[PDB]
RNA sequence: UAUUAUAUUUAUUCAUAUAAUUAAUAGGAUAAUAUUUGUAGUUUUUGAUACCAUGAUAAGGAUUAUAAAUUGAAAGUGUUAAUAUCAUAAUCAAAAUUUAUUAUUUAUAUUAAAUAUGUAUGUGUAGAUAAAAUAAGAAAUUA
């Protein structure tokens, strides 16, 4: 686009505020994940039928040497609190370790737990223009 | 669990100032409009509601 | 079964190379070059 | 098309400041979820107030006669049981059978948000001041 | 509708109230049909061969 | 009467300009004429406006009559007075219809829309089940549930 | 095909794609031509048997003719045998009348 | 000179017929009938691959059940959890959706034994550590042997 | 002076050949004569070129799982590889093993010709995954590391020509080339009868002899290698009582000319002739006498001839059918060959 | 009779990028195949005529009698014996029918002349080119490559159509002639430029229903409820019909000739005729079960 | 109906012609266009820098 | 690689082969994945032959197998890349920049119509078109008509 | 009404007759029809827009299932779902590669057959012609980037390159 | 124009222009190509 | 002057891109015989790249018109055909808002299928701004 956050900003145009077909997006920017939906907790941003098998960042399918980080698509379960191990999510910027485990997390994916869009923004990545802009929209004071 | 009694960085974030005015651009103030009806003039208020 | 794979490119090209080493590329599509393009009968009635 | 500028480097240690920030964010979500489920299920089990509107028939009839006497003399226990919630209220009305279809066609029911205030409220500020930190989709008191 | 005997079933309702007052949801996510889902949308309606839409298959 | 949320205030001139779409809505002119033939009133105004708009619809697909290049210019404010008599006829009729409905609603004991004054029962407008806990025009807090208007015998 | 997919590497698999797309084998039958006599001397299908057939088959029949569309196998001969079997089997079923 | 035939001449039709073969699958001779038992279970190479839906793969699917049981042991398919068999250990494993059984939600479901309340306003203020004292007698349910 | 990606390579032919070969030049590619392809890479450098070249299922990726490196720097942030032993405490390992990627041969047509399930497509022909030695698809050690470099790699050097060959692959590619790259007639002149098909062949012959035709046919549906001739003998024998000329003719044709003419044996022809009799088929009697007569191609090239005593028994059966069925012209024809 | 009577319907649908290409293509192929179909039914018609020429009680085959009288019972409450003549009138009536249909064809095949040929009406011509409504792929698509503005892409929308018109030649020939079909298939090569052909063939066949293998027996004792047709029951719970029925019956020791028939549900003589290699039944033997 | 009556009794064409019942309003909507927000008439908002 | 002897002008044009072999692997694992999903999800008893306890152990085994199916392609067909073969332009399916029948994008396809590279017929920009279906009921109607002919018309045996 | 689906044998009635659920069973046997048993009786909806000719899009066949709880996730869906084997996805796959000649044959094979040599791309021969000419008029701008450097850093026993000027 | 060249088999501008056949000339068959008949190669396959 | 009308209506809260190796041909049954069953010469060049690397198709109404007629244009808007000589950045799922060039669903009934947006009740409410004479229905101050 304008400021290439990725190497694909080098490659993809914006098309303004291009209106999109309902649920057809080349970039799945799950900007709604950490949405507390009180009576809809085991439903909102979760698997549909309660009696489903687990997703597949949940079983070592082969003879791995290991991995650097899990996805958010692997549910949080008893082994994610008691085992107290390292479970990492590729969130902005590099990775996010779930090292303060709790039991309420048990059952959902880690999407409802890894904040997609942070309330703290580092002006260390923003431009001399973006900072004034975030002041404009009310994010950083000035 | 055991919700920590001190918050480190998340609660400290800059407060997004609530929208001041209403309506378009959240700037349309709270003062009378063209739409206000009158109960002192006629059995049908003017301007009437449809 | 032979029709599912008789149009193989290399089968085409071994027909081509066989016609080549038998010295015949006149009937063949690729291996013929018709460089003499024929002209038309000019008209005495419309010479303009 | 101007060559899109590379996003500058993320910075020093910010990968871990985001670690700790999100950390205590889900930490805060722990309590937020706890309190929100508290508020939603108390909302659920609390006996609500009237879903219908007393501005239309047959619920404009006096609070003594007609469909009101049928309400007192067949369903007065069921509504207090099922907490006056408009959904079970209207379904008990559908199963009372002696009103017909009217429990939609003639009955006027409060809007979804005028319906979910607890029993016997008298303000208009209740719905407009219900707590905004209990992410109940408005399913709290 | 031929229905399984020994199964307690309803009939298609009569009063236009019970559908308003049932717990029936609305189709929120994408809209699939097991054959149409090959073409992935109306606008990008795919076709293997340029056959007529009024084709009378033998 | 179902629609009881808030409504948009449009002047008679633009409520009439909608022409044969809603102003000369034939099925609405009819359904308000039915209120008159029930109550037993002469439909002089609605019939006058219906005549005018039947003319206007019959002579909408046609061109205006030619103007003459008069520096003295009389046609202008004469057709002006013509139009604005038609307009005044329709202003009177607008008011008659509104009055008859806001009176018949107090007679049928039916509730009008929000802040729709009915001088048959209440000197101010009907405020109830509103998107605001303040009066939309008086800035008076609303009672819960909606305020009650008529008797209770039905 | 005889434009472009007639001749090269893609000729093969395009012939596959074509004939598989066309692999359907429609079988139409005249129920009046089931109204025949079994060589046992019994009429093969009587009015009651035609009733049992039309009621066994919901949408396969129409305008006095029964249609089954062999859509199973990629090879048309195998759709042929499959449709012949299914037709014969719905006949054995309807013949209980 | 500007001519093109309206109809390909017989001669060039004859060239275009001759130059190329005739496929044996254009004749459809038939005297034996349909082979009810073998012809469909004929050799695995010259097999009639069903095509389209799963509902036509009847041999392959029995085959898939058989292979998958022949390789996949219960010592592997054991651990595979449901969502509910893991969601069981939430402090609120069960709360009725607000649709129907919103009138069936109970207070007793609320684990007030794991959070705390201030009575001056009625709010639950914080949550005790349950990941400490969390003692389950059936970490995986009673059907799980490892 | 030079910035080069590959340091060193390897020769394809060895010095017992090159030292005599070099004395004639190679007529090389005009625009780039020296062609350092994939075959010439080292073992390690080509393990790199094979590890990478896939999206998340080439172990070249730090978080692909079979990755070798333990450290990866993410924009000046280091992440280190959580191994399987730390991981299994929350990602319980289910690893069926090397047999869980190789589907049965009876699901090839359902899986579109394939048997493997690898990221890397496994062509069964030689000329596609051929690295230096032709790529043999060994279905018993198909790893994710992929040592044999037989895979149809995605983004490797010299991948474009083979991706084009794969897309220009034939209609029946995996099945035909997989069949023929195995199961060939041995120089002893014999048919390929194997070890693991003998018990299944026993099942087939016993069932068909008992007369359980469809049962034997459902079992024959599992004939992966070739059956010995007696299996066809029994699978045609079962048809005799019911008169299944159609099922019988198809049982014959499946080995006849399709399976190295195993089915071309006098007694199988005798069974199918009997079915022609019991089905009352003047034209099928003659078809079976026709396969008996054979032609040069079978009778000489594939050397699937029939012992003259069996020729005679089948001819007497044909005459006994025909002159019993009054088919004077065709009986006289067979006696003409007599 | 005539135009609504057929045995093999070839609807050759010619596809071309331009409807004028296929409008003229269909005329070319329709005259080719009118000259073909005329010759092929001239052949079949001279054959049929010379056949019907000399039909009487002295012109018939044993195969045909054995097919006409392969029935256990018929209309008179008794099995029918069809001679050379009762089958003579049958085959002559059939051949009268076939000649009537064939000559109606040829009459349609000479009627179109260069002056007033109407190939879009079969009642005049054999065959008739049926139009087929074109495949038409209208597609909106942008033209601008503006990366900033979606509006300025939208307003640039151009509609363009991938057309592909067809024509359907319907040869309703009342008898399948593989030689004509051979002449039809190699239009696949002399067809015009950017024009192809899909051949629809609808040809009458014979599929036999048969006793042993596809039985019309009573319902069983145990009823197949809804459980036997659940999901994946189509492949687990059922076999691929038909049922394999053991056509080899083992003789019991103290058996009779009519006891094995009273056991297998057959007539004694029919069991004799499906086991015609034996005269008296010995123990331990196998017997071919007649389908009857 | 006007053409039906002209066809049943011709000389009634003249009053039908004159009254314009046999008249065809040569009108249609604006076709379906994505460059229009309602598809028919309105072009999307224009903004100067 | 490393930009030495590039034969094509778009280094990204390797992604088209990459995508077509993505499609191949999708066709290869498609049947297996669909039957795996069916059997793992089936709740009402499969048949009178496999039911209950055997059903739970079998379901979990085939789920273990669907998980062990390494190389499996379970990314939905609407989620794969969709790029123009010619100038390597990507097009989001469902929006004007994707010609469906030629598998090209607004850009390359616009180039190929304003030059003579495709044979199309220009029709009016505001109307509906020549197809009576596309005129009749919009776009879902032609979707319906297409599925009706490709699937629904066969009285499936 | 809430009616129990009852079905009396053909034996209880004092006239036997084939009953319709048994006929349903015979049909789901013959054509391998799955009988979904959770099918409620109150949901016999038909697609009016498709089944009712009072809309512009009357199709006659229920062009979809009026059932909001739908998705490919369901096995009842997966059962009646056309698979992408031999669909347009395959045709596109096997004919839509950036260069079309690489779908009809191999470029080297075609070259060695029609010409002699295997020719470069038009783009490559562009680069090579520019090499031929911009190294004719001038030099000293190049670089030496190779696939394998062992033979350049290590020339053969001879081959002492020329120093230019 | 371009490195990724024109393809002479799909493109109407090529197929139609004066060095090819236009759609309004009557698009017939121009000359019957009997190639597989003048001299057919012998059947020699790579795979024995 | 004539060959002829804009002062009306409906409008304004607007956001989405990611985890490096593009260099080549290699035919298998019903074909009168190739183990060519399994076709083995490494390492002399460099542009479309993270980088200069020409061209070529949009948006934008203000006076060629009334009858059998359409209220959308060339001035070129990212990807394209000759300038080389910093670096591999390219979707196979789950993704990080600063980007002018955007029509949001408004109070009787509110989460079931690849998951699908929890915030902004407020007198229709500053300033400046949007669209349209086309199946809808509009009428009078030419340069």
GROMACS .gro file of C-alpha atoms in nm, chain H residues 31-47 49-50 57 59-64 67 70-73 75-77 79-80, chain I residues 92-96 99 102 104-110 172 175 179 214 217 220-221 223-225 244-247 249-251 254 258-259 283-284:
model
   72
  721UNK     CA    1  -2.465  -5.914  -2.766
  722UNK     CA    2  -2.381  -6.044  -2.416
  723UNK     CA    3  -2.553  -5.790  -2.193
  724UNK     CA    4  -2.438  -5.619  -1.879
  725UNK     CA    5  -2.197  -5.804  -1.653
  726UNK     CA    6  -2.362  -5.771  -1.313
  727UNK     CA    7  -2.080  -5.900  -1.095
  728UNK     CA    8  -1.735  -5.875  -1.250
  729UNK     CA    9  -1.733  -5.588  -1.501
  730UNK     CA   10  -1.748  -5.327  -1.227
  731UNK     CA   11  -1.497  -5.502  -1.001
  732UNK     CA   12  -1.270  -5.567  -1.299
  733UNK     CA   13  -0.898  -5.508  -1.277
  734UNK     CA   14  -0.787  -5.226  -1.051
  735UNK     CA   15  -0.617  -5.056  -1.346
  736UNK     CA   16  -0.900  -5.076  -1.595
  737UNK     CA   17  -1.140  -4.996  -1.313
  739UNK     CA   18  -1.357  -4.497  -1.109
  740UNK     CA   19  -1.681  -4.352  -0.977
  747UNK     CA   20  -1.744  -4.445  -0.402
  749UNK     CA   21  -1.587  -4.976  -0.273
  750UNK     CA   22  -1.321  -4.717  -0.199
  751UNK     CA   23  -1.492  -4.615   0.124
  752UNK     CA   24  -1.508  -4.964   0.270
  753UNK     CA   25  -1.145  -4.971   0.163
  754UNK     CA   26  -1.074  -4.645   0.346
  757UNK     CA   27  -0.690  -4.910   0.566
  760UNK     CA   28  -0.518  -5.105   0.969
  761UNK     CA   29  -0.279  -4.817   1.034
  762UNK     CA   30  -0.434  -4.587   1.298
  763UNK     CA   31  -0.407  -4.728   1.652
  765UNK     CA   32  -0.293  -4.561   2.123
  766UNK     CA   33  -0.298  -4.262   1.884
  767UNK     CA   34  -0.668  -4.180   1.849
  769UNK     CA   35  -0.600  -3.835   2.335
  770UNK     CA   36  -0.809  -3.655   2.071
  928UNK     CA   37   0.005  -3.470   2.234
  929UNK     CA   38   0.186  -3.651   1.955
  930UNK     CA   39  -0.015  -3.871   1.722
  931UNK     CA   40   0.231  -4.010   1.467
  932UNK     CA   41   0.103  -4.323   1.294
  935UNK     CA   42   0.250  -4.606   0.654
  938UNK     CA   43   0.074  -4.423   0.166
  940UNK     CA   44  -0.392  -4.828  -0.051
  941UNK     CA   45  -0.363  -4.905  -0.421
  942UNK     CA   46  -0.742  -4.940  -0.423
  943UNK     CA   47  -0.775  -4.567  -0.352
  944UNK     CA   48  -0.553  -4.442  -0.635
  945UNK     CA   49  -0.846  -4.357  -0.859
  946UNK     CA   50  -1.027  -4.197  -0.569
 1008UNK     CA   51  -0.383  -4.193  -1.701
 1011UNK     CA   52  -0.181  -4.546  -1.284
 1015UNK     CA   53   0.177  -5.021  -1.322
 1050UNK     CA   54  -1.979  -6.175  -0.646
 1053UNK     CA   55  -1.530  -6.062  -0.762
 1056UNK     CA   56  -1.060  -5.987  -0.716
 1057UNK     CA   57  -1.125  -5.614  -0.678
 1059UNK     CA   58  -0.589  -5.799  -0.710
 1060UNK     CA   59  -0.303  -5.551  -0.717
 1061UNK     CA   60  -0.033  -5.761  -0.880
 1080UNK     CA   61  -2.321  -6.545  -1.674
 1081UNK     CA   62  -2.181  -6.501  -2.021
 1082UNK     CA   63  -2.139  -6.129  -1.958
 1083UNK     CA   64  -1.953  -6.152  -1.626
 1085UNK     CA   65  -1.645  -6.257  -2.091
 1086UNK     CA   66  -1.536  -5.965  -1.877
 1087UNK     CA   67  -1.339  -6.193  -1.643
 1090UNK     CA   68  -0.932  -5.858  -1.783
 1094UNK     CA   69  -0.452  -5.651  -2.008
 1095UNK     CA   70  -0.247  -5.860  -1.764
 1119UNK     CA   71  -2.170  -6.564  -3.144
 1120UNK     CA   72  -1.994  -6.615  -2.811
   0.00000   0.00000   0.00000
